[PDB]
Scaffold this active site. Structure first.
Site, mmCIF file in Angstrom:
data_model
loop_
_atom_site.group_PDB
_atom_site.id
_atom_site.type_symbol
_atom_site.label_atom_id
_atom_site.label_comp_id
_atom_site.label_asym_id
_atom_site.label_seq_id
_atom_site.Cartn_x
_atom_site.Cartn_y
_atom_site.Cartn_z
ATOM 1 N N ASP A 57 0.764 -1.247 0.000
ATOM 2 C CA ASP A 57 0.000 0.000 0.000
ATOM 3 C C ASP A 57 0.794 1.296 0.000
ATOM 4 O O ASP A 57 0.209 2.364 0.139
ATOM 5 C CB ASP A 57 -0.986 0.003 1.182
ATOM 6 C CG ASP A 57 -0.305 -0.148 2.538
ATOM 7 O OD1 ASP A 57 0.926 0.062 2.662
ATOM 8 O OD2 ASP A 57 -1.025 -0.475 3.505
ATOM 9 N N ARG B 22 0.563 6.630 0.030
ATOM 10 C CA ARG B 22 -0.134 5.557 0.707
ATOM 11 C C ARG B 22 -1.409 5.442 -0.135
ATOM 12 O O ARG B 22 -2.053 6.446 -0.422
ATOM 13 C CB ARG B 22 -0.443 5.962 2.164
ATOM 14 C CG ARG B 22 -1.402 5.045 2.945
ATOM 15 C CD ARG B 22 -0.879 3.611 3.120
ATOM 16 N NE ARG B 22 -1.729 2.799 4.007
ATOM 17 C CZ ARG B 22 -2.803 2.098 3.628
ATOM 18 N NH1 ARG B 22 -3.214 2.081 2.363
ATOM 19 N NH2 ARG B 22 -3.463 1.387 4.526
ATOM 20 N N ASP C 165 -6.202 -1.715 2.795
ATOM 21 C CA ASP C 165 -5.363 -2.223 3.880
ATOM 22 C C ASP C 165 -4.786 -3.548 3.418
ATOM 23 O O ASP C 165 -5.473 -4.566 3.419
ATOM 24 C CB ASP C 165 -6.177 -2.490 5.144
ATOM 25 C CG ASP C 165 -6.615 -1.235 5.838
ATOM 26 O OD1 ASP C 165 -5.916 -0.202 5.716
ATOM 27 O OD2 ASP C 165 -7.658 -1.296 6.520
ATOM 28 N N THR C 166 -3.539 -3.525 2.980
ATOM 29 C CA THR C 166 -2.884 -4.735 2.524
ATOM 30 C C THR C 166 -2.168 -5.397 3.694
ATOM 31 O O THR C 166 -1.937 -4.758 4.727
ATOM 32 C CB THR C 166 -1.843 -4.407 1.462
ATOM 33 O OG1 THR C 166 -0.949 -3.414 1.975
ATOM 34 C CG2 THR C 166 -2.508 -3.895 0.211
ATOM 35 N N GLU D 236 0.839 -6.597 5.854
ATOM 36 C CA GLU D 236 2.210 -6.120 5.969
ATOM 37 C C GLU D 236 3.189 -7.248 5.743
ATOM 38 O O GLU D 236 2.976 -8.348 6.221
ATOM 39 C CB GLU D 236 2.453 -5.525 7.356
ATOM 40 C CG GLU D 236 2.901 -4.065 7.365
ATOM 41 C CD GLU D 236 1.754 -3.083 7.171
ATOM 42 O OE1 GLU D 236 0.922 -3.288 6.257
ATOM 43 O OE2 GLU D 236 1.692 -2.094 7.935
ATOM 44 N N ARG E 17 2.929 11.137 4.090
ATOM 45 C CA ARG E 17 2.687 10.360 2.881
ATOM 46 C C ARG E 17 1.460 10.898 2.133
ATOM 47 O O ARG E 17 0.435 11.213 2.755
ATOM 48 C CB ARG E 17 2.465 8.883 3.223
ATOM 49 C CG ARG E 17 3.647 8.220 3.880
ATOM 50 C CD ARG E 17 3.346 6.788 4.313
ATOM 51 N NE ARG E 17 2.240 6.657 5.266
ATOM 52 C CZ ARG E 17 1.852 5.498 5.804
ATOM 53 N NH1 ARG E 17 2.481 4.377 5.490
ATOM 54 N NH2 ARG E 17 0.837 5.445 6.654
#
Length: 130
Positions: A16, A30, A35-36, A38, A76
């Site tokens: 992301d 971002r 929401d990928t 981690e 970001r």
């Protein structure tokens, strides 16, 4: 109306987060509303690889800011990223490699679109939804 702006890939960090040259200066973005996992969480490596592959093979990268706040507390940029016209945010969600995140500060233009894709990926028990 939202506007697409060209960017040039510098470096893909993970699923992301992408590093781009935007308006003559490097900046970390971002991806909005996703929401990928981690990288190493289950599927984290897969989401990273998918995002990387998508932006490296692209001839044109475009960034599109939403109507809300354009940067987060970490500095970001918050945008929808397009690789040759295909939205990476939606692509990740459609493939079951990310979930639609909660709206942040009024950035919700593409929330419905992403919610539809997520439903379908879930219906196909794809990756994260298997």
């Amino acid at each position: 109306k939202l506007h697409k702006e060209p960017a040039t890939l510098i470096k893909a960090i993970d699923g992301d987060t992408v590093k781009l040259m935007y308006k003559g200066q490097p900046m970390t973005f971002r991806l909005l509303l996703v929401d990928t996992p981690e990288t190493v969480e289950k599927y984290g490596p897969e989401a990273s690889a998918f995002t990387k592959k998508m932006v490296e093979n692209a001839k044109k990268i475009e960034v599109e800011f939403d109507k809300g706040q354009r940067t987060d507390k970490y500095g970001r940029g918050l945008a929808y990223i397009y690789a040759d016209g295909k939205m990476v945010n939606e692509a990740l969600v459609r493939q079951g490699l990310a979930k639609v995140a909660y709206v942040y500060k009024g950035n919700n233009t593409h929330e419905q679109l992403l919610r539809k894709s997520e439903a379908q990926a879930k219906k196909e028990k794809l990756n994260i939804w298997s």
